Design an enzyme around this catalytic site. Sequence first.
Site, mmCIF file in Angstrom:
data_model
loop_
_atom_site.group_PDB
_atom_site.id
_atom_site.type_symbol
_atom_site.label_atom_id
_atom_site.label_comp_id
_atom_site.label_asym_id
_atom_site.label_seq_id
_atom_site.Cartn_x
_atom_site.Cartn_y
_atom_site.Cartn_z
ATOM 1 N N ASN A 1 20.177 43.560 78.217
ATOM 2 C CA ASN A 1 19.005 44.133 77.596
ATOM 3 C C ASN A 1 18.260 44.986 78.635
ATOM 4 O O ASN A 1 17.880 44.482 79.687
ATOM 5 C CB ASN A 1 18.042 43.021 77.070
ATOM 6 C CG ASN A 1 18.558 42.365 75.793
ATOM 7 O OD1 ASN A 1 18.526 41.126 75.605
ATOM 8 N ND2 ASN A 1 19.058 43.204 74.910
ATOM 9 N N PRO B 1 12.727 47.009 90.358
ATOM 10 C CA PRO B 1 13.385 46.477 89.144
ATOM 11 C C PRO B 1 13.615 44.960 89.192
ATOM 12 O O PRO B 1 13.591 44.377 90.272
ATOM 13 C CB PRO B 1 14.716 47.225 89.125
ATOM 14 C CG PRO B 1 14.419 48.507 89.879
ATOM 15 C CD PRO B 1 13.569 48.018 91.016
ATOM 16 N N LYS C 1 14.813 52.814 93.759
ATOM 17 C CA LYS C 1 13.711 51.982 94.234
ATOM 18 C C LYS C 1 14.064 51.268 95.542
ATOM 19 O O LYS C 1 15.229 50.935 95.784
ATOM 20 C CB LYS C 1 13.295 50.975 93.137
ATOM 21 C CG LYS C 1 12.854 51.635 91.806
ATOM 22 C CD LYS C 1 11.459 52.258 91.915
ATOM 23 C CE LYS C 1 11.192 53.284 90.826
ATOM 24 N NZ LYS C 1 11.163 52.714 89.436
ATOM 25 N N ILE D 1 10.035 49.754 85.690
ATOM 26 C CA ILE D 1 8.979 50.704 85.332
ATOM 27 C C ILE D 1 9.572 52.102 85.354
ATOM 28 O O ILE D 1 9.805 52.668 86.430
ATOM 29 C CB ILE D 1 7.824 50.699 86.343
ATOM 30 C CG1 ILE D 1 7.396 49.274 86.700
ATOM 31 C CG2 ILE D 1 6.681 51.604 85.813
ATOM 32 C CD1 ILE D 1 6.499 48.653 85.700
HETATM 33 C C1 LIG Z 1 11.318 46.794 90.246
HETATM 34 C C2 LIG Z 1 10.821 46.036 89.196
HETATM 35 C C3 LIG Z 1 9.455 45.803 89.140
HETATM 36 C C4 LIG Z 1 8.968 44.989 88.125
HETATM 37 C C5 LIG Z 1 7.983 44.048 88.392
HETATM 38 C C6 LIG Z 1 7.612 43.135 87.411
HETATM 39 C C7 LIG Z 1 8.221 43.168 86.161
HETATM 40 C C8 LIG Z 1 9.201 44.116 85.890
HETATM 41 C C9 LIG Z 1 9.572 45.026 86.873
HETATM 42 N N1 LIG Z 1 8.666 46.319 90.093
HETATM 43 C C10 LIG Z 1 9.186 47.038 91.073
HETATM 44 N N2 LIG Z 1 10.485 47.274 91.153
HETATM 45 C C1 LIG Z 2 23.749 41.306 68.409
HETATM 46 C C2 LIG Z 2 22.988 41.404 69.565
HETATM 47 C C3 LIG Z 2 23.334 42.382 70.487
HETATM 48 C C4 LIG Z 2 22.627 42.474 71.679
HETATM 49 C C5 LIG Z 2 23.245 42.989 72.812
HETATM 50 C C6 LIG Z 2 22.527 43.104 73.997
HETATM 51 C C7 LIG Z 2 21.196 42.709 74.038
HETATM 52 C C8 LIG Z 2 20.577 42.194 72.904
HETATM 53 C C9 LIG Z 2 21.297 42.076 71.722
HETATM 54 N N1 LIG Z 2 24.372 43.189 70.231
HETATM 55 C C10 LIG Z 2 25.060 43.059 69.111
HETATM 56 N N2 LIG Z 2 24.756 42.138 68.213
#
Ligand SMILES: *c1cc(-c2ccccc2)ncn1
Ligand SMILES: *c1cc(-c2ccccc2)ncn1
EC number: 5.3.2.1
Lengths: 114, 114, 114
Positions: A97, A1, A32, A64
Amino acid sequence: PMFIVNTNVPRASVPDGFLSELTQQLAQATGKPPQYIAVHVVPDQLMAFGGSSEPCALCSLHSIGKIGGAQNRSYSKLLCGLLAERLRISPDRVYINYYDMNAANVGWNNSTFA
Amino acid sequence: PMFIVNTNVPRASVPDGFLSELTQQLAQATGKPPQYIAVHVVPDQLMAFGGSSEPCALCSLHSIGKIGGAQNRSYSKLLCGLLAERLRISPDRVYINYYDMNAANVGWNNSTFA
Amino acid sequence: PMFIVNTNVPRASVPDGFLSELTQQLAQATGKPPQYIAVHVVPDQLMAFGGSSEPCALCSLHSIGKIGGAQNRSYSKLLCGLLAERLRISPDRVYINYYDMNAANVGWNNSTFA
Ligand SMILES: *c1cc(-c2ccccc2)ncn1
Ligand SMILES: *c1cc(-c2ccccc2)ncn1
Ligand SMILES: *c1cc(-c2ccccc2)ncn1
């Protein structure tokens, strides 16, 4: 991650070993290996949450798989806990997010995970 | 709504009040109370747009719904307007990536919005 | 394409013409005009990869239009190649998230690309 935190909390307020604590905790939560977990902390940001410049954080967790309703609530509790305890940021001033990456859409070591 | 702008414009050139003006204008545009809105401005970046290091901006707007063709054109007009007026960046040197987030994939206050 | 690299490598280690080289290489690789290409490099970051603070990079590539396993593997080879040669980052310490953006979800010049 991969976990990224952007915050208006100053560099000095990020405790020693914070990145290693994130890594350990994320390993536990995602299932992980620690060796593949990436963490990124960005202090001193010019940011506002609700029009206020009180401490806040805007975060992302890319994984992933291992992303979904119940899992995400759990990560949020864990991650908000950590930011509250370590950076003294109120959980209600934190947005995270969550992204479920397709293995084909992630590059590493000169190719993808496809 | 969460709006992030990364720019090569220096910090001194970001006018006082800019994050509040972003918040207010986004509240007006999205129909959301300002209390929900997060804004983040990252100046002094090493960036190029179309082979040139003239002022430019790479931005994102994440929203839980309220993302679509016409709404996005409206946001782009508003946000490029502000970047040009306040940061003196030409609209044709701004990219804004729009993301429609699922409430389940947004963490806040130890949980999600699900 | 839009290419963003976040790294713990110090700014002094990023070569003078690095942005221009990324732009040129991405143009030549994607067969796309360099006028549309944006590049952003963020050195000196507080980050860890596998719990280690050895040099690493977290990157994204956004394109309008699909990038299959074939294109993504090819981009990863190019991009990790550049990061290794220029920033001395091991390819096994690079993550690259690929995003296929819809034109209607990309703002530019007061409107979208839709
Ligand atoms: C955790 C996250 C990922 C990964 C690699 C690139 C972009 C997002 C997530 N890979 C392994 N473990
Ligand atoms: C506007 C945006 C969001 C938000 C929260 C977390 C990630 C992206 C956007 N929440 C409420 N209002
Ligand atoms: C490469 C990338 C793009 C682009 C533009 C805006 C947002 C994401 C990607 N356009 C052309 N060439």
